[PDB]
Antibody
């Protein structure tokens, strides 16, 4: 299987530099180029450049020439994208992709880099307990409230990814304070609330927040 | 250099419908035109390369055609999982992308399932009270939530967001959070989320009495 695994989300102050990594599965570096593509949140896609891990040769898009450096470490099968002199408009999800020179056929999961001078804050995680007020025809809704964090993103899984059916993880809301909040909910059988364990796994990589919250009736 | 223009900006269509999306280049790019599918929050996925070559594992209902400047992506039988934004990309010169076409699915009316969550003991101890109202799996997306505290309409103390369309049942869900101080929360009895939606003939109230 082909997989490209990128480094975590980061906050960076204006004028600084960010370096995103991209760990490729075996065989990739010996047969393919690696491209970097960015996507401003709520916007479209923009190619930054490519590296051929074989020869170490690079090609950069005109608009990033001088600001971007793409490197490859063949010993670890890891590619890197460094973007210097960061400005507010460099806030985007950065993707690495396997590049045949004719298409991008596999893409990393993406890395959200937020360029901001504001303080990083980890969320509090509160349970949304199942009760008589969250039942409907034999089903029960439960969840987690992930409150007061900056910047994006928070990711939520349930039971370490083993619970996906009926999960809704909502887009973040921006509070008046500049902090974000989000909810993640799941609907389950009401019958088994006494025997099953439900844990929301909340990650906020910019603040090293990693919280596993058990949600009980 | 080469600019890509996609049409339309969005399409809404029923399951089984034929969907046609077009991509135009500012100059001739031969057949070096790729199509990607992107789900909200996820990485783009290659569907078609070299204008008309179907990527491995991609359903056959996807097809591409064109050469030169005018290109089309066709979904022959739209499925709920086809909800996504679709991007074209030229690779004749330095790669550039179209601005995307959002494809959404039309389906039958579904009323929301409405739930309410009082503040957790953990949060109350910290000095804040967030009350969450959940509207599950409704269609269409237009839904109205009003918060009432002791029958008094609230304003300025709530935030809400809606999900992207569901990839299996084509519905939407909505979460609304009412936030007040612990002190304010304990001055009132009844916390009510009142929901208006096409699938409901009258507003539906979901409420609890504090305690």
């Amino acid at each position: 299987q082909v997989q490209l695994v990128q480094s975590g989300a980061e906050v960076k102050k204006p004028g600084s530099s960010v370096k995103v990594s991209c760990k490729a599965s075996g065989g990739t570096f010996s047969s393919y180029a690696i491209s970097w593509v960015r996507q401003a949140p709520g916007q479209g896609l923009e190619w930054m450049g490519s590296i051929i891990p074989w020869f170490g040769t690079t090609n950069y898009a005109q608009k990033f020439q001088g600001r971007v450096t793409i490197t490859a470490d063949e010993s670890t099968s890891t590619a890197y994208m460094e973007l210097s002199s960061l400005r507010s408009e460099d806030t985007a999800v950065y993707y690495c992709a396997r590049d045949s020179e004719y298409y991008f056929d596999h893409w990393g999961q993406g890395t959200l880099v937020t360029v901001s001078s504001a303080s990083t804050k980890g969320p509090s995680v509160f349970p949304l307990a199942p009760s008589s007020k969250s039942t409907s025809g034999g089903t029960a809704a439960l969840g987690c409230l992930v409150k007061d964090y900056f910047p994006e993103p928070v990711t939520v899984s349930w039971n370490s990814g083993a619970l996906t059916s009926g999960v809704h993880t909502f887009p973040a809301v921006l509070q008046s304070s500049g902090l974000y909040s989000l909810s993640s909910v799941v609907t389950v059988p009401s019958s088994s609330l006494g025997t099953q364990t439900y844990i929301c796994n909340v990650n906020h990589k910019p603040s090293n927040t990693k919280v596993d919250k058990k949600v009980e009736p | 250099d080469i600019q890509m223009t996609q049409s339309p900006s969005s399409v809404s269509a029923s399951v089984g419908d034929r969907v046609t999306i077009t991509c135009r280049a500012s100059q001739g790019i031969s057949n070096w035109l790729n199509w990607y599918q992107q789900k909200p929050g996820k990485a783009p996925k290659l569907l078609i390369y070299a204008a008309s070559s179907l990527q491995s594992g991609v359903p056959s209902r996807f097809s591409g055609s064109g050469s030169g400047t005018d290109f089309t992506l066709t979904i022959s039988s739209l499925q709920p999982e086809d909800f996504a934004t679709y991007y074209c990309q030229q690779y004749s010169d330095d790669p550039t992308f179209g601005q995307g076409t959002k494809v959404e699915i039309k389906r039958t009316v579904a009323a929301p399932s409405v739930f309410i969550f009082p503040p957790s003991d953990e949060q109350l101890k910290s000095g804040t009270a967030s009350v969450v109202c959940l509207l599950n799996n409704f269609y269409p997306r237009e839904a109205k939530v009003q918060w009432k505290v002791d029958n008094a309409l609230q304003s300025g103390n709530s935030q809400e967001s809606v999900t992207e369309q569901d990839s299996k049942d084509s519905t939407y869900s909505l979460s609304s959070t009412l936030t007040l101080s612990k002190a304010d929360y304990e001055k009132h009895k009844v916390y009510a989320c009142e929901v208006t939606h096409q699938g409901l003939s009258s507003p539906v109230t979901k409420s609890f009495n504090r305690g």
